[PDB]
From Swiss-Prot, chain B:
Its EC number is 3.8.1.3. This is Fluoroacetate dehalogenase. Changing residue 153 to N: Reduced catalytic rate with fluoroacetate, but increased catalytic rate with chloroacetate. Minor effect on substrate affinity. Keywords: Hydrolase. Transmembrane segments: none annotated. It catalyses: a haloacetate + H2O = a halide anion + glycolate + H(+); fluoroacetate + H2O = fluoride + glycolate + H(+); chloroacetate + H2O = glycolate + chloride + H(+). Catalyzes the hydrolytic defluorination of fluoroacetate to produce glycolate. Has lower activity towards chloroacetate and bromoacetate. Residues 30-268 form the AB hydrolase-1 domain. The keyword Signal does not apply. The active site is at 108 (nucleophile), 278 (proton acceptor). Changing residue 183 to F: Reduced catalytic rate. Minor effect on substrate affinity.
């Protein structure tokens, strides 16, 4: 029993060469693509998307391999779940809708797709907002004891299959809820709509979806890092105007090294900005994208 | 139906204030305490301990909380599973046998107990051997992307309870065999006696034992690190003559050059690599046993 958390939004299955992207589409006006991260699905936008839909055509997409999007076959390099490949697939999806120049807000893994998209194909983006991330390279470059403990899952989920898949299968419901809760300000699931938690829980209950998530993190440890590294070493900066939002529980300083036009603000929230702080997140997003 | 892998060794249940230490005890001569690590038990010594027992009174102990040793209840600081506490508990155990001055060889977590013992209570040790470790501080200090991937379990098992415990609980056999396999040279279980594997698997099958292992790793991420940090920043060196053995394909050598590291920690340290994965006494029993007999003699 999965609730429709985007009343008035259409549901589109967008064909790409790598499989279907599922998206809820609402509103009218300039196209704005919203990308979720881990361990969520597009429904994480359910509290801010209607506010954006007042001014934009809002496309709330499941990342390749996530949610109801198709899961492209991975390979030894985790290619389809590299942010470069997911960005390419989402570019293809947006082209199916006739959107070759669009606004993009990404959270978590979707924000990684988003800034990789901005680096690879900046002409595709009017404006970019990234929610509660630093570039993948920065996470690995600042890897120390404190980060390793805090984002242990970056190294755990990146272990070779089937180690994470098997351990995740030990208690998937616990794991996804533990991830949701532990990264909120409150530390529990109270920030979330329980119908949204059900979406996340059901997606996480599928072993194939969990494997994709590990592929994403495997990409995150390997090719994504290498792709970011090439840009760092080449001085490649994001030229799209961008907003960096982060949960108070210095990202702007970091993003300034990656982006030529970045503004930023802390949001009184944990990691899940659009759900813990939907009004402030939605406000900042409309202000920026308007 | 767990095999006796120490024929002719006795068995001792040693009372301490923090619970009983199980140990196999054999040989005669100077006391030599052997400490296993994760995810093993004292039986990992079963191929080298008889050779040692020709020269030494060999005490092959399960670490506090591991194997058949009792499991003291942990606390918010994981105190009984800090290497400091384990060392004090094993010192107490050894005193019960009348060993107030003994040789010590540790592997993995037991090697962490061992060098912490040597830092806290160096007068208890005649000589110290640590097998395939660097100090906990050094692993954390060198925890970059490559190392965080290699020893992810350092951060995974240190996650707050019950996260690792819940994931381990779904298929404990898989994880213990995965870790045994992945840290060997071959990358499989072929180096191990299958009877020893059964010991490891049975110990790991107990959810309380798994929790203790996570507590060990939690202590490893927090108090153990802090204890080490104080010593390294105070320039405190182990004064006990020590031997650092590591596997050419082991974990220690992935973080740095182990002898260079240990010389920062120990005033009198010799080192040798052994062609082996992490599990020196089982992958390379003869070479390990020879290095230890030679050093402790
Ligand atoms: Ca459970």
């Amino acid at each position: 029993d999965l609730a429709d958390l985007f009343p008035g939004f259409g549901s589109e299955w967008i064909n790409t060469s790598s499989g279907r992207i599922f998206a809820r589409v609402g509103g009218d006006g300039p196209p704005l693509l919203l990308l979720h991260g881990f361990p969520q699905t597009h429904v994480m936008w359910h509290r801010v998307a209607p506010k954006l839909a007042e001014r934009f055509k809002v496309i709330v997409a499941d990342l390749p391999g996530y949610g109801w999007s198709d899961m492209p076959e991975s390979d030894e390099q985790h290619t389809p779940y590299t942010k470069r490949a997911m960005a390419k697939q989402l570019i293809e999806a947006m082209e199916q809708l006739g959107h070759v120049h669009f606004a993009l807000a990404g959270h978590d893994r979707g924000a990684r797709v988003s800034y990789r998209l901005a680096l690879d194909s900046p002409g595709r983006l009017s404006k970019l907002a990234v929610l509660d991330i630093l570039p993948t390279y920065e996470y690995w470059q600042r890897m120390n004891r404190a980060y390793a403990l805090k984002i242990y899952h970056w190294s755990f989920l990146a272990q070779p299959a089937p180690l994470p898949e098997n351990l995740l299968g030990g208690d998937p419901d616990f794991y996804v809820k533990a991830k949701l809760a532990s990264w909120t300000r409150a530390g529990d699931l109270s920030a979330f709509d329980p119908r949204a938690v059900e979406h996340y829980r059901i997606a996480f209950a599928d072993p194939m979806r969990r494997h994709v998530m590990c592929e994403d993190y495997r990409a995150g440890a390997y090719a994504d890092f290498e792709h970011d590294k090439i840009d760092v070493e080449a001085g490649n900066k994001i030229p799209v105007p961008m907003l960096a939002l982060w949960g108070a529980s210095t990202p702007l300083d970091v993003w300034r090294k990656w982006a030529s036009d970045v503004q930023g603000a802390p949001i009184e929230s944990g990691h899940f900005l659009p759900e813990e702080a939907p009004d402030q997140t939605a406000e900042a997003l409309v202000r920026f994208f308007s």
